[PDB]
Amino acid sequence: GAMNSSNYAELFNNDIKLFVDDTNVYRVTVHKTFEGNVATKAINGCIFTLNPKTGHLFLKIIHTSVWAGQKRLSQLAKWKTAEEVSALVRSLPKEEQPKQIIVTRKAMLDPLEVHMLDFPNIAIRPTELRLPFSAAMSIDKLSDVVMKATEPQMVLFNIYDDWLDRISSYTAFSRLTLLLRALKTNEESAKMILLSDPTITIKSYHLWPSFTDEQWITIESQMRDLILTEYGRKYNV
């Protein structure tokens, strides 16, 4: 059924699975019209599809052209997500297809289930975790490729960079979720933390800086402080 704290290690066993997050698929700026009404302008979006074990990120870029002439875009966005996830599974060799797909918002279950009727053997599951994947558009390199796209496009990343060479997938997911939670709660502070020391760089082929084991500890410690802090600044505690 649903995925929660009690079955959290299942994410790092050897059954292929993907998280799907749709929170950046349909994105708008809201503005005033000359007549003093309000209108939206869509901007490019993305589907965040992640293998938590490997770090493989299938970033489907959703180009604004896909909304042209369409009505009820928040509901179409969910079906558009489901179509693209289904297409991706179909594109994969059978032995590479996931056994489970975990959606991060429950409104994605029915659209994905209907699109995956051909794959009765793939379980479509919700989660009770409040995962911070919406903050993936705070990662500069991901925001850039999305905003620059002129057509629909799939781009492949490893969101753990090279971390699995030194840590387990459990620890790499924990780091990712802490980084993302920090970016969501205070993007500016989070970013100031990550890029303070100019001697630490981000390799062309990576998303995050090349931190030593000890520098990651310091970084991880500062991201917690931020999250505990912003929780005080928010709740006055």
Partner: protein, 300 residues
């Protein structure tokens, strides 16, 4: 006017005939039911005084044979039987008629309730759902499961209802996933109406049979089937106007007839609120919405 004569009433039993019911005491001199209107199907049903578990009963059409009830003390129930010797039966019936040992089907002449609940119900169609072909009548009870229920365990004793599943490849055309799930007109009009029922009278017929089994025997899967068939129409943007008008009348009389104290289990809040207030046809069931709102406003 036809007659379902009984050999005897050896066990205390509540007897249903269509929407009427009466109590018979252990070994009371009761020998059946007379004046049954020709031209409709009927259902005679049973709830023993000792064990309210297992409502059971028989769907029949008096034009298809002479039917009598005999209590079987081995199997412990009132069994429907056919008498092929038509003089032996007419003689047996006349004797009981003369001795006034039969209750009279108590149809009020103004009352079209039964006709309105059974307009599209046919005995030959019931017989291709309840499979037991050596008999012209059809047994049903509370615990019989539907073909679909067994998929999710004895097949001979199942209700072979028409399998409806909104998240199935039958319901969803490749490439129309969003379209067909949010607007079920394809599934209603092409898959179900044109290729299985053949017309809407047949769709209305299983819908009517489903409700009656759900209400008379408390059959859970019949309740599921009834709601599924309602929801498929209400969730279709494109429905012939004659079918919408007829559905409204159909449902009105089912809602009117439902016992007020059984509304609790026999009415699915989600299906009804969806059908009346959110669905494509939310404005198309005026009579049904008015009776539902005045009689069961709690449910909504």
């Amino acid at each position: 006017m036809n007659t379902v004569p009984f050999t005897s009433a050896p066990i205390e039993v509540t007897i249903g005939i269509d929407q009427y019911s009466f109590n018979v005491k252990e070994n009371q001199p009761f020998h059946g039911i007379k004046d049954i209107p020709i031209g409709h199907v009927h259902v005679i049903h049973f709830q023993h005084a000792d064990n309210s578990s297992m409502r059971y009963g028989y769907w029949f059409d008096c034009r298809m044979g002479n039917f009598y009830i005999q209590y079987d003390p081995k199997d412990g129930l009132y069994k429907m039987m056919e008498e092929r010797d038509g003089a032996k039966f007419e003689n047996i019936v006349h004797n009981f008629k003369e001795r006034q040992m039969m209750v009279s089907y108590p149809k009020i002449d103004e009352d079209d309730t039964w006709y309105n609940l059974t307009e599209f119900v046919q005995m030959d169609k019931i017989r291709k759902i309840v499979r037991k072909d050596e008999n012209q009548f059809s047994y049903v009870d509370s615990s019989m499961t539907t073909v679909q229920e067994n998929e999710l365990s004895d097949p001979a004793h199942s209700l072979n209802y028409t399998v409806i599943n909104f998240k199935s490849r039958e319901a969803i055309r490749p490439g129309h996933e969003m379209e067909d799930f949010l607007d079920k007109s394809y599934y209603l009009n092409t898959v179900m109406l044109q290729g299985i029922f053949k017309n809407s009278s047949n769709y209305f017929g299983e819908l009517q049979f489903a409700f009656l089994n759900a209400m008379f025997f408390g059959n859970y899967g019949s309740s599921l089937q009834w709601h599924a068939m309602i929801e498929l129409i209400c969730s279709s943007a494109t429905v012939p106007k004659h079918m919408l008008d007829k559905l409204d009348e159909i449902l009105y009389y089912q809602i009117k007839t439902l016992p007020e104290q059984y509304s609790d289990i026999l009415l699915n809040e989600r299906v009804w609120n969806i059908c009346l207030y959110s669905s494509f046809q939310k404005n198309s069931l005026h009579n049904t919405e008015k009776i539902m709102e005045n009689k069961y406003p709690e449910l909504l």
